[PDB]
Every structure is written in C-alpha cells, then in structure tokens.
Amino acid sequence: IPCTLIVVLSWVSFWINKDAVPARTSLGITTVLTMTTLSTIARKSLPKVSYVTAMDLFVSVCFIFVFSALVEYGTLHYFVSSQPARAAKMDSYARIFFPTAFCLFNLVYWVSYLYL
Amino acid sequence: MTTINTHLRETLPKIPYVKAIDMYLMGCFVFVFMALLEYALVNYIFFSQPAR
Numbered sequence A: 001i002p003c004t005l006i007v008v009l010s011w012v013s014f015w016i017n018k019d020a021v022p023a024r025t026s027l028g029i030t031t032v033l034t035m036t037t038l039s040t041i042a043r044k045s046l047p048k049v050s051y052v053t054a055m056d057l058f059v060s061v062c063f064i065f066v067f068s069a070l071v072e073y074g075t076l077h078y079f080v081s082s083q084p085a086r087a088a089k090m091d092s093y094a095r096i097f098f099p100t101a102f103c104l105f106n107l108v109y110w111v112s113y114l115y116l
Numbered sequence B: 001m002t003t004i005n006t007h008l009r010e011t012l013p014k015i016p017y018v019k020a021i022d023m024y025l026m027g028c029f030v031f032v033f034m035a036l037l038e039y040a041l042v043n044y045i046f047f048s049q050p051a052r
Ligand SMILES: CN1C(=O)CN=C(c2ccccc2)c2cc(Cl)ccc21
Pocket: A035, A036, A037, A039, A040, A043, A055, A056, A057, A059, A060, A063, A064, B004
C-alpha cells in the first residue's frame, strides 16, 4: 500500500503546470527519497538472501516508475526550450501511459506470483 | 546518498580501514557533490557571460 501510494504521488506531478520547475523537480526528488527510505526499511524483515524475491521486484519497479517520471519531466523541460512541437503532447501522453503501464505490471505480477 | 550510506554504515562494525563499498559510496558522493559545485560555478559565471 505505501509504495503504490508513493507511485501515485509521483503521478500527481503530471497535472501540475509545466512552468513551475522547482515544484515538479522537488516533488519528484522528494518522492525518490520516500521510495528509498521505504525500500530500505522494508528489506530488514527477510534475511540476507542473494536472490531476488517477489517483494524486491515490486519495490524495484516502483523505484523505476518514480525514476522514469522524474526523467520524463527532465526531458520535458529540455524539450520546451529546444522544440515545443514535441513537448506539448508528451505530458498528455504520460498522463495515460504511466497508470496503464503500472496497472498492467500489477496484473501480470500478481497473477504470475499467485499462480506459483 | 547520505541516507543510503547511513543505512549501510549503521549496520556494520567499527573498522578503521576503508572498505570497497565505502570507496564506491564516496565516489558516488563525490560525483553528486561535483555536480552541485558545477551548478554553483555555472550560476557564478552566468551573469558575467552566459556563453561560458
Ligand atoms: C536502498 N534501496 C533504494 O534506495 C530504492 N531502490 C532499490 C533498487 C532500485 C532499483 C534496482 C535495484 C535496487 C532497493 C531495493 C530493495 Cl528490495 C531494498 C532497498 C533498495
């Protein structure tokens, strides 16, 4: 529940205006902070095994999602200055591509790990 | 990076020498620190000349 909530927290950056640069950067990087702290405090339950579990993969993909959201805003801020025709409809694409990708990941993950 | 190092530094014994993972964390910290310092340097020269 908290990692998914932090992913939706990173998602809310897309509806914020593209001109407020410190707002979106601070939101993304503080969301990255929260993901790291939650991941570290969550791995202290299980032993020091060297293989990937079904819990490491989930938090790893959540971190990747937050990383991708921040790097997407970074490329957005570079592209509004380089050429605006490509950066106008990128955020509107992200607003629908990020939740569908995360929901598809959740469906495939939960079925693949509850079938085993 | 400080939070990451802290977690690993507050889980191992007090040995005086520098480990390999400590060297990797110090290298990563020096890279992020140098990125912040280059930002300071590009914020300093921006008013005198933005070409540099
Ligand atoms: C220390 N740490 C983080 O900072 C957040 N992302 C990482 C990670 C992120 C991407 C790939 C591999 C590893 C992670 C994963 C676990 Cl299972 C526990 C702590 C943790």
